[PDB]
Amino acid sequence: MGSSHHHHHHSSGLVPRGSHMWNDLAVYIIRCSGPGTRVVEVGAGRFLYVSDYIRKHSKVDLVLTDIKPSHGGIVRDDITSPRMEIYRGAALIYSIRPPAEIHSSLMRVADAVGARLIIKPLTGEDIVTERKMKLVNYGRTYFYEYIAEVRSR
């Protein structure tokens, strides 16, 4: 009895183009994860190109996280005191243009949940962190990834 098919998708799909250098980044993440899992986008805010591109290429549960968003789909939670419950169960966690101060908080989250942390910094600006992350080049775009190792069984 009953129907649990409530199609609520109130969302203005405005995605800035010209993000060719971001395209490969999305594809890279897509290949690392895929459909039937969770991917967390930190620093979504007002730039949802990557996550949208990913969710269109693969029906992966893309979870957007940012403080006080204006877009339907972003988890309106907190990052200065993050809820691990949101990040747990994710296959990959990436951050779009992260400040060189909260990176440490992101690294421990990835390490906790067991997901690959991908940071897209500036072309000529460092993250100012410990030697943990690695510079990777995909297509033409370069970024920093971190493989959070899984706990022993």
Going 116 to 117 to 118 to 123, the CA torsion angle's sign is: negative
Which residues, 6+ apart, have CB-to-CB distance to 27 below 8 Å? 57, 138, 139
- Which three-class secondary structure string do you get for the chain? CCCCCCCCCCCCCCCCCCCHHHHHHHHHHHHHCCCCCEEEEECCCCCCHHHHHHHHHCCCEEEEECCCCCCCCEECCCCCCCCHHHHCCEEEEEEECCCCCCHHHHHHHHHHHCCEEEEECECCECCCCCCCCEEEEECCEEEEEEECCCCCC
59 is written with which tokens?
């029906």
Going 35 to 132 to 24 to 67, the CA torsion angle's sign is: positive
Distance, first Cα to last Cα, the chain: 42
> 49-57 and 20-32 are packed helices; what angle lies between their axes, rounded to 10 degrees?
50
> CA-CA distance, 21 to 23, in Å (whole number)?
6
What Cα–Cα distance (Å) separates residue 133 from each residue in 21, 41, 117?
20, 18, 9
Are the C-beta atoms of 87 and 112 separated by less than 8 Å?
yes
Domains present along the chain, CATH in parentheses: 1-153 (3.40.50.150)
Which residues, 6+ apart, have CB-to-CB distance to 15 below 8 Å? 48, 49, 52, 53
What Cα–Cα distance (Å) separates residue 100 from each residue in 19, 74, 120?
22, 22, 11
23 is written with which tokens?
């395209």
> CA-CA distance, 115 to 121, in Å (whole number)?
19
> CA-CA distance, 52 to 47, in Å (whole number)?
10
Q: Which amino acid is at 18?
A: G
